[model samples]
Target: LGVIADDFTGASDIASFLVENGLSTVQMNGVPTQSLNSKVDAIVISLKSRSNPVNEAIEQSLRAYQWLKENGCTQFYFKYCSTFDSTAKGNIGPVTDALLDELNEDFTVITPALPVNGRTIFNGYLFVGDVLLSESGMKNHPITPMVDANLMRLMDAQAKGKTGLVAYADVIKGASRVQECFAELKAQGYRYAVVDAVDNSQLEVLAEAVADFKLVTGGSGLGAYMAARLSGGKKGTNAFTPTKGKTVVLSGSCSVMTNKQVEKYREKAPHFQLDVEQAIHNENYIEQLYQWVIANLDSEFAPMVYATVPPDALKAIQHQFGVDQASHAIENTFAKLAAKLKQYGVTNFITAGGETSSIVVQELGFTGFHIGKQIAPGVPWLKAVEEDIFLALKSGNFGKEDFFEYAQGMFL
Candidate 1:
C-alpha cells in the first residue's frame, strides 16, 4: 500500500503499524527523488499538511499519491489521526475527495477508529474512551477543535458529496454485509461510507470489506488489520541499534497528555521549562539552554528543555507575541538547539509535538530512518539513515506518562 500521512507523528504511526503487522515499511519525510531500498513492501509519504489550507492540502496529497502510483504502489491509503482532528473546512474531507477523483472512484470508506487508543466510531459518532469526541479535550484543540462527534455531518460539511453511515449492526455481520451495505449506500448516492468499528475484531471485518477498494482512508489501526489480512510476516524488518550517548528530551507541546507527561517527568528527572517570552525576544536563550545541558552532561537521567506551558499561559503568550511570531520563535529555538545538541554528541533525542518534531528532523538533516521497536503505539525509536542520532518523535497525546523514562531506557 502507498500510504500518505498528514503529519510527522502520523507517518511514524502508520509506519509502525505496517511494521508490526506484516509489511516491510519505509517512511520518507516527504516525496523523495532518490530510489529507496528495494526490499520495502510498503512506503509512506509524510506530508506536513494536516492543518494547511484545504486546497493546499489537496494539492500536496495528490502529488504524493501520484508519485507513489508511479513507483508501482497499486493500493493507496490516506492516513489521518483517529480523533479526526480536522476543521469544518477540512484538509481531511477535501483531500479525500480529491484523491477519490484522482483514482476515479465514486465511493470510499472513512473510519478513523483505533480501538487500542480508546478511539471508536459507532453509528457515525466518534468516542474517545467513553466520552464523545465533542466532550473530550479535543473539542478545544488548538489546531482543529472537533466539536462534533458525527463523522457523517463532519464529512458532508466539507466534502463535495453526500455522506452516510455503515452502522455497527451491519458491520458486525461481516464483509459480505459490509459490501452489500456499501452497494446500497452507493445506489442511494452516498459518496463516502463512514464505517463503525469498536475493536480490532470489527476493524478486521471492515478491512476485509474494503480490501478491493482502489483507495481507503483511516487511521493506523485499520492499516494494521488491513495489512495483516493481505500479507504475513515481513521478509525483512529494519532494526537499527540506537547509539549510546547523551540524552535530551525536548518538548514544545501543551496538549493535556503532554502537560501531564512534563509534570510527571519533572518530579524525578532533570528538567527546565522554557519561557516562550524569552524564546521570542532573547537571542541568547538557546545558548543558555545549550550551556545548561552541557553543565549536566554527567547526570544519570536525560536532561530536558521544554516550551510546554499550561493552556492559559500558552494563550497569553500567543496573544502577546502574535501566534505566528511566538510559534516561529519557539520552533527556531528548538531547531537550533537540536543542531547544537547533535554537534555536542547528544545522540538520543526524544521530541514531543508534531510541529516540533518536524522542525527537529528537518534541522537535523535526517532524510529517512531505520525503524526500531516502538517505545509506544504511535511513537518509535528511529535511527537516522544519514546521521548518528536515534530519535523518538511523539504525537503530543500519544505515549504513557512515563514515556520519557521508557524512551530513555531504550537508549541504555
Candidate 2:
C-alpha cells in the first residue's frame, strides 16, 4: 500500500526501492490497514499527475497518506516529478500545499533543462529533468534511480573530466572524432545506454543493454508491438505482418499523433502491425480497431498488440475519442475493455503509458514474459528503467514539428 509519486509505472518500482531501502510498503496498490495486515512496515508517500481532474487521483491517493499519518508515517520518499504537464505555470505550488499538509514533508522534485543534441535534437522532459536536477538542489531517492543515474553519470564523468560517458542523437552529424563518444562509452563495459529507439541506433543500443538497461527493448521510440517484442511477451505477430512469426512485440504508449511504431512493425513484417494509441481518442477508433481485429480474429487481420497513448496526451485524445473527459477511469477502464475485447476473441496484448502498459502486461496472465537477469553481470540493464519509456515514445521531444507527427512516425 506504499504510495509513490510516479505519474504511472513509478508506483511498483518505487515500492521495490522502498523495500530495497530496508522499509516494507503495504505492497503495491492495495489498501493499507493499521492492522499487521498492512503489507509493509512504513507508510511511504508518493503521488502521480496528469491533465486529469487532479481531484480524483488526490482523493484516491490521500487515503494511503491519511492512513500513514494516523499510524505515524513521518519519514517517506515522495516526488513531484512529471507534474505540471505542459503547463508553463505548473500547478505545483497548489498541489504541493496539499502534500505538505498531508504528508508533512518537503517533497523532492526533479526539475531541470534537458541537454541539447547538436542543432536539431532537444532533450526530453526526463532529459530536461536530468539537466535541471543536476544543476539544481533536488534530492534523489532510489525512486527515480535510473533518471538519477543518467544525471549522476554524466555529471560525475564531466566533473572529473572523464571522457566518453553520455551521448545524444542529434549531435552526431558526423563528428570528425566519432560524433558519439557518449554512446560509444555506453557500448564498452557500460552495457546499458539510453537512446531514442526510433533513432534505429537506439534500437541497437536496446540490444546492447543486456547489461545496464535493456529490461525490454525500449527508449522513447517504444511502441506497444516493439516493447512486447523486446520484453518477450507477445505470442505472435498478426496476419498483416511479414515477420509475423519472427517479429517481436514492443508494447508501450503510442504517440497520439504518430503511427510510426505500428508502421515500423508492419514494415519489418508486412501485415504484422497491431497496436492502438488512443483508440478511443477519436470515437474510440482504436477500441473499434481492436474490435475490428476481434471480429475478424480468424480472418487475415493484423492482430493488435494493444497500446495506449502516453498519459500526458489523454486530455486531447480522450476529447477526440468523445469520452467524457469528466469521467475517465484510466487503467481500470482500459484493462476491462481489453478484457471484453479478449472475450470477443482478442487474446494477446502489450500496453504502454506506464501504469497502463504494466497493467496490460499484468493482465496478460502469463509469466512466459520472464526477462532473464543481466548476462555477464548483476542486474540486466542496470541503468535501464521504465521511465526511459518516457524518453523514447515521448511526444514532441522526438524532434518532430507537429504533435500528430508522433503517431505519424509509426504509420502513414
Candidate 3:
C-alpha cells in the first residue's frame, strides 16, 4: 500500500494507525530520492502541501504517487485531515482530481470518519463531536477555515466532476451494500462518493467495499481499516519504547482544542507564551526562548513554550502582524528553539500544530522516522531515523485537555 499524506502530523497519524492495524509502515518526510533499504507493507510520503497553492499541492502529490508506484505500490490512498480541512479553492479536491486523472481512474471514495477522535459523518455531513464541522472550532482556523458541513457541496465546489453520497443508511448494511452504492454512484456519473461512517465498524465495512478501488481518499481513520483489510488482520512487530531525557513541549497551534490543551498544561508545568511581536521584530527572541526552556528543564513536567492562544487574541496578533508574517515568525521561533533544545541534550519533543511540526522536523533534519507508540489516537511518539531524538507531533485539534501532561507521563 502507498499513502500520500498532506502534512507531517497527518502522515504520522496514518502511519501509526497503519502500523497498529498490522502494516509495516515507514513515513518519509518528502518524496524519496532513492529506494528505501527496508521492505515494508506501506510507505507514506508526508508532504507540506495541505495549505499550499492548488497547483503546487497537485504537483507534489503526483510526484509522491509516481515514486510510490515505481516502488511497487498497487493501491493509492490520499490522506487529508479528519476535519476535511481545505478552502473553497482547495488542495484536497484538486489533488484528488489530479491523482485520478494520473491513474486513469474515475471512481474513488471519501471516508473521513475518525470516530475515535469525535470526527464522524452522518447523512453526508461531518461532525466534530456533537457539533457540525462548521460550528466546531475549525470554522475559525487560521489557514483552511472550514465553514461548511455538507460534504457533497464542499467537494463539488472544488473538484472537477460531481460528487455523490452513500449515506449511513446504506453504510450500515455492510460491505456488499456499500459496494452497490459505489456502483450506483459511478453509473450516475459521480467521480467521487462521500461515504458516511459514524463509527469504526462502519469504517470497516467501507474499507472492505473499497478494497479493490485504485484510489481512496479521506482522513487517517480509514487508512487503519484499509491496512487491516489488506493485511488480513496480520500484526506487525513495530513497537516503541519512550526515550528518557529532558523534554519540552512546543505548541504553535491556535485551534480551540490546542488552546485548551495549552491552558491545562500551563497550570501544572513551567509554561512560556510566545510573544509574537518580539518573535517577529527581535533578532534574539529565539535565543531568549531557548534560555527560558533551558532554565525550566528540571521541572516535574516538561516545560511548554506555546504560541497557542484563544480566538480573539489570535485575531489581534494576526491583525497586528499580518497573518502570514505572524505565523511565519512564530514557526521560525519554534523551529530554531527545537534545534537549540536538541543541541542542549533534550531528547523528547512534543509538538502541536502541523506547520510547526513540519518546520521543526525539517529544521532538525529528520528525513524519515520510525513510528512509535501513540500518546493519543492520532498522536504518536516518533524516533528520528538519523538521530536519537523522539517527537510527539500532535494535530491542533487532537488530544485531550491534559494531553501535554499525559504525553510527558509516558516517558517520565
What is the C-alpha local distance difference test score of each model? 0.86, 0.33, 0.88
Ranking by lDDT: 3, 1, 2
In model 1, which residue pairs have backbone atoms overlapping below 3 Å?
none
Q: List model 3 lDDT by residue over 1-412, tens digit each.
A: 8999999778877898898888877798899887666667888999999888888899999999999998889999999999998877878899999999999999898877888779899888999999999999999999888899999989998999899999888888989998888889999999999988788888889888988999999998889889888878855444574667899999989999999999888999999999888998899888888999999999899899999999889999889789999988988899889999998899988899988888998899888877766778777777876778888988898899999999878666
Local distance difference test, candidate 3: 0.88
How badly does each model clash, as a count of residue pairs? 0, 67, 0
Best by TM-score: 1
Comparing 1 with 2 on lDDT, the higher-scoring candidate is 1
Give one digit per residue, the lDDT tens place, for model 1 in 100-150. 999999999998998777989988999999999999999999988989999
> What would the TM-score be for candidate 1 when compared with the true structure?
0.70
Could you tell me the TM-score of candidate 2?
0.30
Best by lDDT: 3
| Model 2, span 77-181: residue lDDT tens | 333332113121222333433554564432222121112321011232233333443232322423222323242243233121221222445323323222244
For candidate 3, list the clashing residue pairs, or say none. Answer: none
The TM-score, computed over Cα atoms with residue i paired to residue i, of candidate 3 is 0.68
Better of 2 and 3 by TM-score: 3
